[PDB]
Amino acid sequence: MVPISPIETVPVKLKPGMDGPKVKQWPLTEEKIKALVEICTEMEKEGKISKIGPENPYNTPVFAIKDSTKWRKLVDFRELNKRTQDFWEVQLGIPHPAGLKKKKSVTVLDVGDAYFSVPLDEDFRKYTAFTIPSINNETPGIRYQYNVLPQGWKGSPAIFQSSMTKILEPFAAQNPDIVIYQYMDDLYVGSDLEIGQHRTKIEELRQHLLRWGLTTPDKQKEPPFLWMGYELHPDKWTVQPIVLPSWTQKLVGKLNWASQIYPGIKVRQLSKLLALTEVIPLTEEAELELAENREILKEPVHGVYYDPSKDLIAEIQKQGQGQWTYQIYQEPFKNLKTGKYARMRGAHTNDVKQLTEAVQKITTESIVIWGKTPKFKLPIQKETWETWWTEYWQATWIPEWEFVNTPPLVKLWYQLEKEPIVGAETFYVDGAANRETKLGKAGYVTNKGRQKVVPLTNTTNQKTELQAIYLALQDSGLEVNIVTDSQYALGIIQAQPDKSESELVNQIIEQLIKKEKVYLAWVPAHKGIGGNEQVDKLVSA
């Protein structure tokens, strides 16, 4: 006997206050009970379980399912899961293939035999007890309890990965020239060494796994590893080609998933559509690009792997209608990955703020995948950006970036004046509505005696205040001072939307684009501010 090192036990406990499981063994067939006894007897020969006496009051239902060749024991731990403590899930975000680095040689090993070489905490075995109902219920069923992480128990994945990692640590520490990844019951070991000096280092690792009695089978996977919905190749990666099925939803996640390598995977008209009740036709004619989504996913696209000696670059584009598209690369047209950004649901917005949010999303994505920020290429002029952030009332920032001249370009569509314009007409505007009737008026009076009041139906104080301002923009020349008492309208206009949901706001924006100079001034209401005092009388009743 060559002494094997013990695998250290993880102390497991049940959720505080909760007690173990007491489920009732369901009725089987004589045939099924015959099958289960065969399995449990071999497993018992292996140490995987042990026959228990009558003291344990916990039971977990056991079933049998057959057939490819034979039957297999299915132990339903759903109730023990509910009562076992919480575990640190050893990982919840997967690697992204664009972060992987190439290796000359990648060997794959089978480590499945180690899963049932991981002992269960002794004081916890009691809770894994199960009963094989006996033939004709005429004897006490056979009773077992697990000595190893059960297949299907709550803690088994976290404890297994955790245990494999502790074994591998010294070997990976002493061989920095190899990398090791663990996935299901296989290990992947890659290196850039000469094929000889790499095959030896594999021999050392099987040796080192032996010191814990880990029988590593000595035996050729496909160059296309199929992993987590990807296709990893020695030089490229792509998504595992998957497609989308006229009654219809879940194509949103599929189209999103494909969009990380395939460019221009629009999801807007499709996502606009949305319980599982009824499917309507694409009244925004989503088939103009939905058939192009099928045409985009028709040809195959691949991404490259990461090269830490080369810089990292991210390029963004405006796709229109709140949609932004981006690629990240190190050498032109060799994308590491692609993606899209859709605007946040809001009432108003502008292109500069969306682009900023795209940048933040890519920055954070890039820190995750590569641990650094990319250099950005953006469709916005340096001068446009400087003007924006020097005058925006919020703090804003964009990490190192350069202008790329790919139309359409993000621009500022209008810029209010900071001081009143000398020699521009001054329009005092005001508007008001009747809460009961929804009747109101909107209008203005100017220093030159120009005047207007327009009566309105089905309206509110907020709408009439906007409409007053719209009226002065419509009826003035290229330069104009406007005086309102609407804090609501000032809040909207000073946030500088370039696009709105409200069609009134959009018409004001369109008037703003056409002017040369606009000064907007706020005064408080009901205070006799002349002009605003004179137009309040005309518009309130």
Partner 1 sequence: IETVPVKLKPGMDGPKVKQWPLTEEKIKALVEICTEMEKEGKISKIGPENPYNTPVFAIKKKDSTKWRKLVDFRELNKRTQDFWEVIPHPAGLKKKKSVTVLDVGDAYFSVPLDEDFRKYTAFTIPSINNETPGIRYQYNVLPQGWKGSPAIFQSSMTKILEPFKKQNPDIVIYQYMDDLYVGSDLEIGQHRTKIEELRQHLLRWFLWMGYELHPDKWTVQPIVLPEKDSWTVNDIQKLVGKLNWASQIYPGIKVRQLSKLLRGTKALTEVIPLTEEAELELAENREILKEPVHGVYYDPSKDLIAEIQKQGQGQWTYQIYQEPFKNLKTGKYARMAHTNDVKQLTEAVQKITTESIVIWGKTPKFKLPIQKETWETWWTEYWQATWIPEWEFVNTPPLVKLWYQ
Q: Which residues are annotated as a binding site?
A: 110, 185-186, 430, 465, 485, 536
Residue 164 CB, shortest distance to ligand VTV, in Å, is 15
Minimum CB distance to ligand VTV smaller for 221 or for 527: 221
- For residue 408, say if its preceding peptide bond is cis, omega within 30 degrees of 0: yes
Is the Cβ of residue 93 or residue 241 nearer to partner 1 in the bound state?
93
Q: Is 467 in the site for Mg ion (CB under 5 A)?
A: no
* Amino acid in the structure at residue 483: V
- Residue-wise DSSP of 73-95: EEE--HHHHTTBPP---S-SSPP
Q: Which residues touch 479 (CB under 8 Å, ≥6 apart)?
A: 421, 423, 424, 515, 516, 517, 518
Residues found in the chain: 541
Q: Nearer Cβ to Mg ion, position 193 or 529?
A: 529
Contact partner at residue 133 from partner 1, Mg ion, ligand VTV, none, CB < 5 to 8 Å by partner kind: none
Q: Which stretch binds Mg ion (CB under 5 A): 32-40, 69-77, 333-341, 481-489?
A: 481-489
Taking a C-beta distance cutoff of 8 angstroms, is the pair 150, 121 a contact?
no
Residues 6+ apart with CB under 8 A from 68: none
Q: What is the dihedral of CA 445, 450, 456, 459, to 10 degrees?
A: -40
What residue 522 binds from Mg ion, partner 1, ligand VTV, none (CB within 5 to 8 A, per partner kind)?
partner 1
Ranges within 395-424 binding partner 1 (CB under 8 A): 395-397, 419-423
- Give the span between the Cα atoms of 280 and 285, in whole angstroms: 12
Question: Closer CB to ligand VTV, residue 312 or residue 429?
Answer: 312
β-bridge pairing 479-484 and 426-433: parallel
Task: List the beta bridge partners of residue 325.
Answer: 317, 340
In the block, tokens 């075995």 appear at: 125
Asked whether the beta carbons of 522 and 487 are under 8 A apart, the reply is: yes
Contact pattern for partner 1 over residues 248 through 287, marking x by CB under 8 A: ----------------------------------------
Is the Cβ–Cβ distance between 128 and 153 less than 8 Å?
yes
CB-neighbour burial class of residue 439 (10 A; exposed 0-12, middle 13-18, buried 19+):
middle
Q: According to CB under 8 A, which residues from 327 to 366 bind partner 1?
A: 353, 356-357, 360-361, 363-364
Sheet with 142-146, edge to edge strand ranges = 49-51, 142-146, 130-132
Least Cα distance to 129 among 64, 55, 35 occurs for 55
CB of 373 to partner 1, least distance (A): 8
| Cα gap 229→244, rounded to integer Å | 15
Least separation in angstroms between residue 313's CB and partner 1 is: 17
Contact with partner 1 (CB under 8 A): which of 31, 123, 295, 391? 391
In order of 77, 80, 134, the CA distances from 22 in angstroms are 11, 9, 18
Which one of Mg ion, ligand VTV, partner 1, none interacts with residue 90, CB within 5 to 8 A by kind? partner 1
Residue 310 or residue 537: which is nearer to ligand VTV going by CB?
310
The smaller minimum CB distance to ligand VTV, of residues 189 and 539, is found at 189
Residues numbered 277-296 forming contacts with Mg ion, rule: CB under 5 A:
none
Cα–Cα dist 331/341, whole Å: 23
Gaps in the chain following residue numbers (C to N > 2.5 A): 66, 219, 245, 248, 274
Residue 363 Cβ, how far from partner 1 at the closest point, in Å? 6
**Residue 521 contact partner, candidates Mg ion, partner 1, ligand VTV, none, CB within 5 to 8 A by sort of partner:** partner 1
For residue 411, count CB atoms less than 10 angstroms from its CB and return exposed for 0-12, middle for 13-18, buried for 19 or more: middle
Which is closer to ligand VTV, CB of 184 or CB of 291?
184
Residues in region 155-174 near partner 1 by CB under 8 A: 155, 158-159, 161-162, 165
370 binds partner 1 (CB under 8 A): yes
Near partner 1 by CB under 8 A: residue from 80, 100, 352, 512:
100
Q: Which member of 55, 86, 278, 299 binds partner 1 (CB under 8 A)?
A: 86
Which of 38-46, 93-101, 197-205, 223-231 is the region at the interface with partner 1 (rule: CB under 8 A)?
93-101
The count of other CB atoms within 10 Å of the CB of residue 175 is 17
What whole-number distance in Å separates Cα of residue 411 and Cα of residue 8? 62
Considering the complex, what minimum distance in angstroms separates the CB of residue 236 from ligand VTV?
A: 9
x/- track of binding to Mg ion for residues 414-453 (CB under 5 A) = ----------------xx----------------------
- Residue 187 C-beta: closest distance to ligand VTV, Å: 9
| Residue 175 binding partner 1, by CB under 8 A | no
If contact means CB under 5 to 8 A according to the sort of partner, which of Mg ion, partner 1, ligand VTV, none does residue 81 touch? Answer: none
Q: Which of 231, 289 has the CB closer to ligand VTV?
A: 231
- Least spacing, CB of residue 258 vs partner 1, in Å: 21
> Number of residues in contact with partner 1, rule: CB under 8 A?
78
Which stretches of the chain bind Mg ion, using CB under 5 A?
430-431, 465, 486
